[PDB]
Every structure is written in structure tokens, then in C-alpha cells.
Structure 1
Amino acid sequence: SDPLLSVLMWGVNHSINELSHVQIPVMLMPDDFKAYSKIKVDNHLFNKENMPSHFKFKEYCPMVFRNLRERFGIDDQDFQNSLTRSAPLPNRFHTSYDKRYIIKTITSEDVAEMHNILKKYHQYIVECHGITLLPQFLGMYRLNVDGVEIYVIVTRNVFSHRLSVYRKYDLKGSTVAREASDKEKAKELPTLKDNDFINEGQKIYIDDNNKKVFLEKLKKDVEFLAQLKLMDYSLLVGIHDVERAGEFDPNIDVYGIKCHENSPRKEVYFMAIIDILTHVNPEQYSKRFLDFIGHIL
């Protein structure tokens, strides 16, 4: 009874069904990056209980996002199920009922930026064999329900689908002060920021190897982002306390890192980059971002 949501589920369902009939080659062609499919639905005096009467669904570059899903080790049928077997839950983003995917509303500006970087982004994912801390983009759509038009993007959840998170940080490593809201603090899991970290002595206990890998990854990802003139992105950090609610599937919870053996508490960390689509400058912003994360880890 959120009509936009049901158009989305209807849309995702339809999309994966269509693709199931398409022969998938190993390569994308340049045209695949300029492609889309539109479906306009008009129901007159029919099917009122489920669908809206007049709606639209547009999918951008279905072949590119098909290719990306598989490269991120996501199967189309599983993806469909996660988005359609039961509604996504709100909170401003939605998360799939099974906590695997994030569904964020974006602007037409963002859609244009995505289209602008999609080839280079795709090529990046090829080179690093899908091993990255960048947002994993899984699908991009336009929804129309009688007058209202929204754009959405789908990504992999940085947090675990099983193991709960008792503390979140959103780090940018900026010179201007960043601190969390008192209004947000009241919510079950607040969204702490650079100084809630730098102030309240938060430590991330990972071993020297896990840290070396992570920072090497982070370095390449961030340089790629700067080179695209992208900035204002964050590192999302999630802490799972084993001794409250802790063995994860690193093939589903791909962003997990176990704490080292001498850690004060049994912890799992979930860390990746989020919010890349905004296009003082990009170049130094990345270095300033990389300096910060080095210091806190």
C-alpha cells in the first residue's frame, strides 16, 4: 500500500524475468551503456487491489547491471527473490526484506552522473575482479505512479544480513567539524561521525595484514573516485558485538573483517565506501579522506 514500492517490486520482477530469456555474452557492447527498457501499464477497471491503475517502469542499461550483479557474485533469481518475495522496509532509504540490499531514492542529476561514469565504473570492476570497497551498483530504475516520478538505485548492504550492528560511523575525514545529532542519538542505532570517533576513543582492532589489504583497496578505490571528479563520499563503519546478540559468510557479508585475537571484545567490522554520486576540491578531498582512515585504524 506504498504504491511506488509495489511498482518497484513489480518492476524488478518483470526485469529479471525478461533477462532470464536473454542470452548473456561475456562482454558488453558500447550500446549496452546507452540502453533502457520502458514499460507503461494502464489498467481500466481491473486489478485495483494490488497495482496502481497507471504506472511506468524504466530500467537503465539492463545488460550492464546484469553483468555487474554476476561480477559481484549475485545470482539474478536470488536478487529477484530478495526484492519481491516480501516488501522492502523503510526507516531515507529502504532495505530489502532479507537485509541484503539497499534501495535509495536519487535525483535525475544522480542518474545522469551514474550514466556518465558507468563505463569507467564497469571497467574498474573488471580490473579489480570485483574486489573493491566502492558501492556495488546492482540496478537503476525510474518509477511513475499517476503524477509522481522517482528514481532509485539498488546497492549491496555494507552491513551484515545476519549479524546486527550496535554502532555506526560515517567518516569523511573533513577539516570542518562533524558530530552526530541528539535527535538521532535517541534512535536505536544513531549515526555517529568523525568527532564521535576522534573524541570517544573508538578503536578498530584488526591485525596488520587485514589492515594492509583494506588500506591498499581503499587507496585504489579513492584515487579512482577522485579521478572521476567525485567527492563528498564517506566510509560507513559498522561494529557487531558478538558478546551481545558472530561467525559470518564472507561471500554474503563481503565487507566483514574479524577482529584480531587480542581484541578487548569479540567484534566484527563492516566497512565500505558510500555516497559517491555528488559531482575544497576532489583531488585533495581523497588524500584528506585517506589520511584520516589511516590514523583511525
Structure 2
Amino acid sequence: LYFQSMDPLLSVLMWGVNHSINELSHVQIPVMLMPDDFKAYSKIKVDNHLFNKENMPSHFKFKEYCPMVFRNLRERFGIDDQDFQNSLTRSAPLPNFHTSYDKRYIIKTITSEDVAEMHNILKKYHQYIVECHGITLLPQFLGMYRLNVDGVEIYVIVTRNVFSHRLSVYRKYDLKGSTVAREASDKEKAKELPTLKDNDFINEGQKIYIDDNNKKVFLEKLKKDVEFLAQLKLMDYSLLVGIHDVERAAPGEFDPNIDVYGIKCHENSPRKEVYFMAIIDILTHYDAKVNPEQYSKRFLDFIGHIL
């Protein structure tokens, strides 16, 4: 492992994640998080002269936001820190956002405002993860960092992939229940796997066929998740839906501990499929800005309407 990349910001992220996790290994796991933990960080500035000049950039910084909370979150979400460390570090992330090399994790560039909003909600989010025992369709926020190389400064967040680390998605949708129409562009639609939207789903007559028990379970989690978001005055979020086609292809199978968002289709489905659905893109507050209770009602009715 040398953390080499053509993109210096990915070297620095791999370096940083490697450092972050090793550093945490020299820190006790607390009986519980305290308020100070939610306002915490570690900054590390590196200046090398004529050393490791080929693998990495000579001058850089790495900052990790509330390392103790994100570590706790990882544990709550069933994620081992060394598995995490390996996933983001054994090979470079691939641009599609980026994905870890093993497709377990999403890496996204965000703004300082996003970072401030993550802080704004982090205690309530954490308590909510405690209360729901980590069972939820919220984004699993696993790490949040600031990087500076070459006079360039970005903020990044890591989340769990909604989709399978292994089974491919032939179709993907971003759904909001917008009353205003939402269609993919001709530019988006020109891709191999476009990110389609509400009107695409309707115009295609897309059907998601899940059994009654799974639908109940799913729509109950969804309701509590979205009542929480409405409680925080968050909005503009979407349900991301991926469809694995088992016929193009042991064939139907997935580990529900890794691909935690996976749901098998109804046995009587006309088409043998697996669906991957969860909420993404939650960090937009009403103050920055139809209101959050309304958004959440409208969102939840549309999801109900398609199953």
C-alpha cells in the first residue's frame, strides 16, 4: 500500500483514512459519547522534503470531524474499523461521486455549509441511530473530512452504498414525490446507467413487487425516518432505487449484512428482481430555503403509491 493516485486529493483521502483509523486504535472506546465529542476534530499537516516524493504530494492537510462519533456510528451500523480502513485504502476509489474500490461505500465532495449542517443535526442523528438500533433507511454517515493539497481545499463525506457491493443494477431512480414534474435530461439519459426521476418511473410504468410483510416493514421504517427528517426541518431528499435483474445472469442471492438495503421481489413477480432502496441527500434545511411536514407527507404518499 502506497496510496498512489493520479488524483492527489484521493491519495490524501486514502492516506487520511489510513491515519484516522490507526490513530483511533490508540484511543479507548468510551462507555458513551459526551457533548464535547460532537464538537471535536483532529487536524494533521504534513510537509515532506525529498521524502516519499513519488507516491504522494509533499505538502498536505487532513482534518477529521468528530472522530469518536463517526467511529461509534460505524460500530452501530455493523462496520469494523479495519474492514472500513481496508475498503477505502487498499485500492483507490473509482469515480462513478466516487465508490470505494470494493463498492461498499460512497465518497462525496460537499460544501462547508453541508459540513455545518452535519454538525447542526449530528447529536439528534446519533440519538436516532441509538434509538432505532441502527435499523433505518437514513444515510449511514461513516466519516467526514477536510483535505488541502496544492492550494485546493475540499470537504468529503462517506456513506454506505444503497446498492449491492456485487449484484449489478440495470436501472436506477431518484424519487421525491415532486408535484412539479422531474424527468432525467437527454444528457443523463445518454448514459449506460442513467439516474432517472419521478416522471421516468411513471412513464415507464415501473413496478416494484415486494411481499406484504416486506412492504409493511419497509414503509414503517420509512415513515419514522421521514418524521425524524421533518422534525429537523430537513427536506429535498430522495428515495434512491436500484433494480437488479436476476434473469440477466448463486443468481438471486445477497448477504443482508453487507447489502443491507436489498429486498427480494414477490415470488409471483413477472420478472425475477432484487431492489435496493434507501433515502439519500438529506442535508437541506428549511431556513436555507412547500414546507418540511408537507414535503415528508408528499414524499411518503408517492412511495406508498408505487410500493
- Regarding TM over 0.5, the answer is yes
- CA shift for structure 1 position 53: 1.0
Distance (whole Å) between structure 2 residues aligned to residue 26 and residue 241 of structure 1: 45
Q: 2:262 — aligned with what?
A: 256
3-state SS in 2 of match to 1:292: helix
- Output the CA distance in 1 between the equivalents of 2:25 and 2:269: 47
Cα distance, 1:238 vs structure 2: 0.4
| Cα distance, 1:146 vs structure 2 | 2.4
In the superposition, the TM-score normalised over structure 1's length comes to 0.98
Alignment of 1:1-297 (within 5 A): 2-91=7-96, 93-244=97-248, 246-279=252-285, 280-297=290-307
Which whole-Å CA distance do the structure 1 matches of 2:168 and 2:203 have between them?
24
- SS of the aligned residue for 1:12 comes to helix
Deviations 1:87-118 (A, max 9, x none): 00003x00000000000000000000000100
For residues 269 and 146 of structure 1, the distance between their equivalents in structure 2, rounded to whole angstroms, comes to 42
Partners of 1:111 and 1:22 in 2: CA distance: 24
- Matches of 1:117 and 1:287 in 2, distance apart? 21
Cα separation, 1, equivalents of 2:175 and 2:31: 37
C-alpha distance after superposition, 1:104-138 (max 9, x if no partner):
00000000000010000000000000000000000
Where 1:218 maps in the other structure, the secondary structure is: helix
After TM superposition, give the deviation of residue 183 of structure 1 in Å: 1.4
Q: Deviation of residue 185 (structure 1)?
A: 1.6
Q: How many residues align?
A: 294
Instruction: Supply the distance in 1 between the matched residues of 2:230 and 2:206 (Cα, whole angstroms).
Output: 28
3-state DSSP of counterpart to 2:95: coil
- Structure 2 CA distance for aligned equivalents of residues 285 and 260 of structure 1: 29
Which secondary structure does the structure 2 equivalent of 1:216 belong to? Answer: helix
Tell me by how many angstroms 1:218 deviates.
Answer: 0.3
The separation in 2 between residues aligned to 1:26 and 1:276, in whole angstroms, is 29
The 2-side partners of 1:53 and 1:71 are apart by 36
The runs of 5 or more residues in structure 2 that have no matched partner are: 1-6
Moved over 3 A (4+): none
Matched residue SS, 2:148: strand
Q: Structure 2 CA distance, aligned partners of 1:21 and 1:253?
A: 30
Cα RMSD after superposing both structures? 0.7
Question: What percentage of residue pairs aligned between the two structures are identical?
Answer: 100
Query: Whole-Å Cα distance in 2 between the matches of residues 146 and 18 of structure 1?
Result: 25
Offset of residue 45 of structure 1: 2.3
2:188, 2:180 → 1: CA distance? 20
TM-score (normalizing by structure 2) = 0.95
Deviations 1:157-190 (A, max 9, x none): 0000010000001000011111111112221101
What's the secondary structure of 1:21's corresponding residue? coil
Task: State the distance in 2 between where 1:231 and 1:81 align.
Answer: 34
What is the CA distance between 1:46 and its match in structure 2? 2.0
Q: How far apart, CA to CA, are the structure 1 residues paired with 2:191 and 2:178?
A: 25
Distance in structure 1 (CA, Å) of the matches to 2:254 and 2:128: 27
**CA distance in structure 2 between the aligned counterparts of 1:5 and 1:288, rounded to whole angstroms:** 39
Secondary structure of 2:253's aligned partner: coil
SS state at 1:129 partner: coil
Could you tell me how far apart the structure 2 residues matched to 1:85 and 1:45 are?
A: 25
Q: Please, which moves more after superposition, 23-32 or 228-237?
A: 23-32
* C-alpha deviation, 1:25, in angstroms: 2.1
CA–CA separation in structure 1 for the residues paired with 2:154 and 2:230: 28
Distance 2:222 2:31 in 1: 28
- Residues of 2 paired with 1:191 and 1:75: CA distance? 31
